[PDB]
Structure 1
Amino acid sequence: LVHVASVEKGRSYEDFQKVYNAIALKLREDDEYDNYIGYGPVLVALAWHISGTWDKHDNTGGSYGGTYRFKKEFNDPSNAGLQNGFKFLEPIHKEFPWISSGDLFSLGGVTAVQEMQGPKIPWRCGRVDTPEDTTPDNGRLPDADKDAGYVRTFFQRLNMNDREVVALMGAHALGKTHLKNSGYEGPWGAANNVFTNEFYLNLLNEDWKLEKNDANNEQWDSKSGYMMLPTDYSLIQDPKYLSIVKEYANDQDKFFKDFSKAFEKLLENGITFPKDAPSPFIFKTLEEQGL
């Protein structure tokens, strides 16, 4: 099963920069969301879940089809609350009806990271909307109450190795958990609408206490008011994961480069790019454009 990237007819770099700018201007404008965190975090969370359904064994799921628009996938328990990022992006799709849904969902993620001061993420167009019966079943996204063995095995379904898994998890510097969504409650650190290596620093530097939350699930809580999921805590339990955690705590530039490659890879899994496809785009930030 092959999905071949097909560029939206007659569109080029500057067309997608416009779509970037509209997302970015709206990000600026809707700052009150989730007690003033803004929609940045939920946008990267949406891009990760629409990509996270991929199965490298048969190329089912993945970002290409844009299948999150169908009710079986948006009703996935693993996706509770993500309807807020979808709603955010509705005005944008309306303004640019020519872009595909998978292109827009993935670009929203890229846009969020860059505007939150993270690294440039190269992004490629050409995902094409596929029909409702291509929507993958629920249950492909990962559980939080597991250990490093689980985590390692999970991400291998996405063709990700140890380094990629630890870089990717650094996105938990952003936003927070919400009891009503997931059964976990609280943020991972203090600067949660700015992309930094804080997740790794907090993981190593705080005084974590294992507790049961108000939904009766176990999570790691610090005196600072931070939390870690068991899967997060895994990363300092496995000695291979811990070595890389130390690395990124110690070197944010290294973390930014590895996150950048890994996030692009996640959003492009399952997509075959023609030799003559355009080169990956690197979008300018609003700030870089004077907007």
Structure 2
Amino acid sequence: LVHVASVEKGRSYEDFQKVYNAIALKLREDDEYDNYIGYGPVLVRLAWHISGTWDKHDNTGGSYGGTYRFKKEFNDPSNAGLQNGFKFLEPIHKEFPWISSGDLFSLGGVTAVQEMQGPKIPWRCGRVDTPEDTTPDNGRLPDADKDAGYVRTFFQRLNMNDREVVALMGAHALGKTHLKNSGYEGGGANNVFTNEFYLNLLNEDWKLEKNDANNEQWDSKSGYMMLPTDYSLIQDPKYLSIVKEYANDQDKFFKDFSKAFEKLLENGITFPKDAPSPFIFKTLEEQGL
């Protein structure tokens, strides 16, 4: 099964920079969402969930088809809460009806990472909407109550190795969990992209507690939390080494995250040899906007 990137007709870097800018300006404007976290974190999660349905074995799922717009995927219990990100992106799509849904969802994640002071994430256009019958079934996104061996095996389906997994998980510096969405009680939250997920794993005094949904999570007195799958990264000796690396090298974390996140958002897509090079968008701050 082959999905060939097809550039939206006549569009070029400047068109997509305009879409980036509209997303970034709305991120600035709609600042009260989720107790003043803003929409950044949920847009990153949305980009990951529309990509994380991919299966390397048959090239089903993945970001290309934009299938999150269909009820089966929109209503996946694993996607609870992401409707907020979809609703955020609705006026963007109305202003720019030419961008494909997969391009918009993935660009939302890139824009959020960069605007939250994260690394530059190169981004490629050309995802094409596919029909409702191409929507992947529920159950392809990962469980949080599991251990390191589960995480490692899960991410093999996405063609990610240990370093790529530990880098991607650093996005859990962002935002919070919400009991009503996922059965996990949120702790201290931020909307600035840093390597503090790794520092928190290594430096906090973690206690294994039960939350009000009767699920186990790791909590600290500082008010931070970790899922069992997060904490597995310091229980497994191979993951632990990489956690320590990223805790001690911000730039390395940024560079590895940027590569893994672009890869995640591009899995499943065949780019023609003459496709445009990846775009690196300027932030609002870099543009003086």
- TM-score with structure 2 setting the length: 0.99
Distance 1:183 1:190, change over 3 A: closer
1:81 and 1:41 map into 2 onto residues whose CA distance is 11
CA contact (8 A) 2:188 2:225 kept: no
**Deviations 1:76-115, CA, capped at 9 Å, x for gaps:** 0000010000000000000000000000000000000000
**Deviations 1:133-154, CA, capped at 9 Å, x for gaps:** 0000000000000000000000
CA-CA distance at 1:29 after TM superposition? 0.2
SS at match of 2:170: helix
1:237 corresponding residue in structure 2: 235
> Structure 2: which 5+ residue stretches go unaligned?
none
1:185 and 1:263 map into 2 onto residues whose CA distance is 26
2:247 and 2:185 map into 1 onto residues whose CA distance is 24
CA contact (8 A) 2:172 2:197 kept: yes
Instruction: Determine whether 1:28 maps to 2:28.
Output: yes
SS at match of 2:146: coil
CA-CA distance at 1:130 after TM superposition? 0.1
Report the RMSD for the aligned CA atoms in angstroms: 0.7
SS at match of 1:73: helix
1:72 and 1:285 map into 2 onto residues whose CA distance is 34
> Structure 1: which 5+ residue stretches go unaligned?
none
2:86 and 2:188 map into 1 onto residues whose CA distance is 26
**Deviations 1:221-250, CA, capped at 9 Å, x for gaps:** 001011000000000000000000000000
CA-CA distance at 1:192 after TM superposition? 1.2
SS at match of 1:97: coil
SS at match of 1:232: helix
- Kindly tell me the number of residue pairs found equivalent between the two proteins: 289
2:203 and 2:62 map into 1 onto residues whose CA distance is 36
CA-CA distance at 1:168 after TM superposition? 0.1
Larger mean Cα displacement after TM superposition, 191-200 or 272-281: 191-200
1:192 and 1:40 map into 2 onto residues whose CA distance is 10
2:154 and 2:9 map into 1 onto residues whose CA distance is 36
Distance 1:73 1:191, change over 3 A: closer
CA-CA distance at 1:191 after TM superposition? 5.8
- Pairwise mapping of residues 209-224 of structure 1 onto structure 2 (< 5 A)? 209-224=207-222
2:264 and 2:221 map into 1 onto residues whose CA distance is 34
CA-CA distance at 1:190 after TM superposition? 4.9
2:197 and 2:189 map into 1 onto residues whose CA distance is 10
CA contact (8 A) 2:176 2:189 kept: no
